[PDB]
Scaffold this active site. Structure first.
Site, PDB file in Angstrom:
ATOM      1  N   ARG A  20       3.056 -12.996  -5.406  1.00 22.69           N
ATOM      2  CA  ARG A  20       2.378 -12.847  -4.026  1.00 22.69           C
ATOM      3  C   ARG A  20       1.081 -12.170  -4.335  1.00 22.69           C
ATOM      4  O   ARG A  20       0.178 -12.514  -3.559  1.00 22.69           O
ATOM      5  CB  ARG A  20       3.103 -12.337  -3.185  1.00 22.69           C
ATOM      6  CG  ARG A  20       4.388 -12.845  -2.590  1.00 22.69           C
ATOM      7  CD  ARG A  20       5.357 -12.004  -1.995  1.00 22.69           C
ATOM      8  NE  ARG A  20       6.547 -12.738  -1.114  1.00 22.69           N
ATOM      9  CZ  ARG A  20       7.507 -12.088  -0.591  1.00 22.69           C
ATOM     10  NH1 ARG A  20       7.692 -10.923  -0.323  1.00 22.69           N
ATOM     11  NH2 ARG A  20       8.347 -12.908  -0.063  1.00 22.69           N
ATOM     12  N   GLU A  51       9.111  -9.461  -6.002  1.00 21.89           N
ATOM     13  CA  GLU A  51       8.372  -9.511  -4.810  1.00 21.89           C
ATOM     14  C   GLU A  51       9.205  -8.582  -3.788  1.00 21.89           C
ATOM     15  O   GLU A  51       8.191  -8.113  -3.108  1.00 21.89           O
ATOM     16  CB  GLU A  51       8.045 -10.842  -4.235  1.00 21.89           C
ATOM     17  CG  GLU A  51       9.195 -11.681  -4.382  1.00 21.89           C
ATOM     18  CD  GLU A  51       8.959 -13.356  -4.724  1.00 21.89           C
ATOM     19  OE1 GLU A  51       8.446 -13.881  -3.864  1.00 21.89           O
ATOM     20  OE2 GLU A  51       9.413 -13.805  -5.794  1.00 21.89           O
ATOM     21  N   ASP A  77      -1.077  -1.074  -7.623  1.00 24.30           N
ATOM     22  CA  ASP A  77      -0.680   0.460  -7.679  1.00 24.30           C
ATOM     23  C   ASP A  77       0.723   0.537  -7.224  1.00 24.30           C
ATOM     24  O   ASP A  77       1.515   1.287  -7.724  1.00 24.30           O
ATOM     25  CB  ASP A  77      -1.645   1.207  -6.786  1.00 24.30           C
ATOM     26  CG  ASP A  77      -2.987   1.420  -7.673  1.00 24.30           C
ATOM     27  OD1 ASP A  77      -3.046   1.314  -8.790  1.00 24.30           O
ATOM     28  OD2 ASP A  77      -4.129   1.346  -6.836  1.00 24.30           O
ATOM     29  N   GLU A  82       6.646   1.694  -8.230  1.00 23.13           N
ATOM     30  CA  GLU A  82       7.931   1.504  -8.214  1.00 23.13           C
ATOM     31  C   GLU A  82       8.592   1.546  -9.639  1.00 23.13           C
ATOM     32  O   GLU A  82       9.676   2.213  -9.507  1.00 23.13           O
ATOM     33  CB  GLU A  82       8.338   0.013  -7.500  1.00 23.13           C
ATOM     34  CG  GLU A  82       8.050  -0.349  -6.137  1.00 23.13           C
ATOM     35  CD  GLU A  82       8.895   0.633  -5.261  1.00 23.13           C
ATOM     36  OE1 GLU A  82       8.322   1.454  -4.329  1.00 23.13           O
ATOM     37  OE2 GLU A  82      10.102   0.537  -5.247  1.00 23.13           O
ATOM     38  N   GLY A 338      -1.072   4.199  -2.130  1.00 20.00           N
ATOM     39  CA  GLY A 338      -1.058   3.210  -1.136  1.00 20.00           C
ATOM     40  C   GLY A 338      -0.382   2.729  -0.185  1.00 20.00           C
ATOM     41  O   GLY A 338      -0.463   1.864   0.527  1.00 20.00           O
ATOM     42  N   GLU A 339       0.922   3.254  -0.340  1.00 17.73           N
ATOM     43  CA  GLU A 339       1.921   3.165   0.577  1.00 17.73           C
ATOM     44  C   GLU A 339       2.354   4.022   1.762  1.00 17.73           C
ATOM     45  O   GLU A 339       2.007   5.278   1.471  1.00 17.73           O
ATOM     46  CB  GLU A 339       3.350   2.920  -0.232  1.00 17.73           C
ATOM     47  CG  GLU A 339       3.097   2.327  -1.636  1.00 17.73           C
ATOM     48  CD  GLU A 339       3.100   0.801  -1.606  1.00 17.73           C
ATOM     49  OE1 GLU A 339       2.125   0.134  -2.113  1.00 17.73           O
ATOM     50  OE2 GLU A 339       4.217  -0.048  -1.186  1.00 17.73           O
TER      51      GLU A 339
HETATM   52  C1  LIG Z   1     -12.941  11.738  -1.859  1.00 24.31           C
HETATM   53  C2  LIG Z   1     -14.350  11.537  -1.489  1.00 24.31           C
HETATM   54  C3  LIG Z   1     -14.568  11.668  -0.026  1.00 24.31           C
HETATM   55  C4  LIG Z   1     -15.875  10.850   0.736  1.00 24.31           C
HETATM   56  C5  LIG Z   1     -15.573  10.208   1.843  1.00 24.31           C
HETATM   57  C6  LIG Z   1     -15.247   8.724   2.052  1.00 24.31           C
HETATM   58  C7  LIG Z   1     -13.687   8.560   2.090  1.00 24.31           C
HETATM   59  C8  LIG Z   1     -13.537   6.964   2.558  1.00 24.31           C
HETATM   60  C9  LIG Z   1     -12.789   6.131   1.357  1.00 24.31           C
HETATM   61  C10 LIG Z   1     -11.461   5.430   2.276  1.00 24.31           C
HETATM   62  C11 LIG Z   1     -11.161   4.321   1.273  1.00 24.31           C
HETATM   63  C12 LIG Z   1      -9.694   4.127   1.572  1.00 24.31           C
HETATM   64  C13 LIG Z   1      -8.776   3.201   0.673  1.00 24.31           C
HETATM   65  C14 LIG Z   1      -8.074   3.660  -0.348  1.00 24.31           C
HETATM   66  C15 LIG Z   1      -7.034   4.545  -0.015  1.00 24.31           C
HETATM   67  C16 LIG Z   1      -5.992   5.041  -1.359  1.00 24.31           C
HETATM   68  O1  LIG Z   1      -4.784   5.561  -0.425  1.00 24.31           O
HETATM   69  C17 LIG Z   1      -5.851   3.930  -2.301  1.00 24.31           C
HETATM   70  N1  LIG Z   1      -5.026   4.764  -3.065  1.00 24.31           N
HETATM   71  C18 LIG Z   1      -5.202   2.920  -1.984  1.00 24.31           C
HETATM   72  O2  LIG Z   1      -5.615   1.774  -2.967  1.00 24.31           O
END
Ligand SMILES: CCCCCCCCCCCCC/C=C/[C@@H](O)[C@@H](N)CO
Length: 360
Positions: A20, A51, A77, A82, A338-339
């Site tokens: 996927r 998946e 990620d 997992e 990310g989860e």
């Molecule tokens: C740290 C500096 C701070 C500056 C301020 C700005 C913050 C906005 C950033 C938003 C981005 C969120 C997307 C990523 C999320 C994570 O959980 C990843 N692991 C998922 O891929």
């Protein structure tokens, strides 16, 4: 940054692939962008498709690891999360977690891959270019040990994180983002802008153990763990943090982020201050009070890793080995690698150089 080990040549790898990923194109991408490189590099492989929820985790938990020189994880990620948790759940976790791992990106949510690409000295690239670069690192076969985050929740769940734990704005941008995967890496910009326009703050209690405050003694009675390793820096969530920790006075936040790597995403160079030492992670928080305009500028500057040059007084960075975060007013929503994860409280500590990744 030199390698601390190498895959043998030739070698064979297990490829765990989510069909996927990359909008259902992961298998196609493997065939076009990965397979031909593996052949020239004398890397033999077997493709296993995963998946469903905890399938890759279950597979890794039961695998005869001695038949493989590495596990390559082609999805994002989430799948790496997992695989590492699967490895750590085994009775032989102390040797299993030493099996080298490789992240090949498909689609969005490839912070780990983007971090490794950065560490190898490549330009910040996305999509196919990132996939090719990460395959090239696999073909060059060099390994480096990576830190691992042990996390405890208020329900008593113990889990491991390879990249991040986020709370507040960053976690909300994940929730808002999921419904725009079709936009690829633009979905984080959309999500961020939406949340910026509807900015809010979150009430909570943050404490942490900075690197230089680690001493020769740990707490007398740390958290009890079913299976090792022991989180010697951590005491139960029912007890106050040890007295040598820093308790942040501010109890209103826009975000808190514990980050093990340079990148939050392929276009988000969040931690430009340098690669974490063994047993250390980045801690960021933003205190309530920043304007929506300044947060916007911090976000936009993140692509090139220039956000720290602003010296925004609401943004705090500290290298830590452990932290505790307790949202006020019931449960908080966290993003772990990310989860989604909901809990009354979380704490964690870094374990040094616990697993091995192919990297440049
Ligand atoms: C740290 C500096 C701070 C500056 C301020 C700005 C913050 C906005 C950033 C938003 C981005 C969120 C997307 C990523 C999320 C994570 O959980 C990843 N692991 C998922 O891929």
């Amino acid at each position: 940054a030199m390698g601390s080990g190498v895959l043998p040549r030739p070698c064979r790898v297990l490829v765990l692939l989510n069909p996927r990923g990359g909008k259902g194109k992961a298998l196609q991408l493997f065939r076009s962008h990965v397979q031909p490189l593996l052949a020239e590099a004398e890397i033999s492989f077997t493709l296993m498709l995963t998946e469903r929820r905890n399938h890759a985790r279950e597979l890794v938990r039961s695998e005869e690891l001695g038949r493989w020189d590495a596990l390559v994880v082609m999805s994002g990620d989430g799948l790496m999360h997992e695989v590492v948790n699967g490895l750590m759940e085994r009775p032989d976790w102390e040797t299993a977690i030493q099996k080298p791992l490789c992240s090949l990106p498909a689609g969005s949510g490839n912070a780990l891959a983007a971090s490794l690409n950065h560490y190898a000295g490549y330009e910040q690239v996305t999509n196919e270019d990132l996939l090719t670069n990460c395959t090239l690192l696999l073909c060059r076969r060099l390994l480096s040990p990576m830190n691992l985050l042990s996390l405890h929740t208020a329900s008593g769940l113990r889990l491991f994180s390879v990249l991040s734990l986020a709370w507040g704005f960053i976690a909300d941008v994940d929730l808002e983002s999921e419904k725009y995967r079709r936009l690829g890496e633009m979905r984080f910009t959309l999500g961020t802008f939406l949340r910026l326009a509807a900015l809010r703050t979150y009430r909570g209690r943050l404490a942490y153990l900075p690197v230089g405050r680690v001493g020769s003694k740990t707490p007398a009675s740390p958290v009890v763990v079913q299976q090792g390793p022991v989180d010697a820096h951590l005491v139960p969530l029912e007890e106050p943090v040890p007295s040598h920790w820093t308790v942040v006075p501010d109890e209103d936040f826009v975000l808190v982020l514990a980050l093990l790597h340079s990148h939050l995403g392929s276009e988000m160079f969040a931690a430009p201050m340098g690669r974490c030492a063994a047993g250390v992670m980045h801690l960021f928080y933003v205190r309530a009070g920043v304007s929506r305009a300044m947060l916007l500028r911090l976000f936009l500057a993140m692509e090139k890793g220039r956000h720290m040059e602003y010296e925004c007084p609401y943004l705090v960075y500290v290298p830590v080995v452990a932290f505790r975060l307790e949202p006020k007013d019931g449960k908080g929503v966290f993003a772990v690698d990310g989860e989604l994860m909901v809990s009354e409280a979380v704490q964690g500590q870094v374990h040094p150089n616990y697993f091995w990744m192919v990297s440049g």
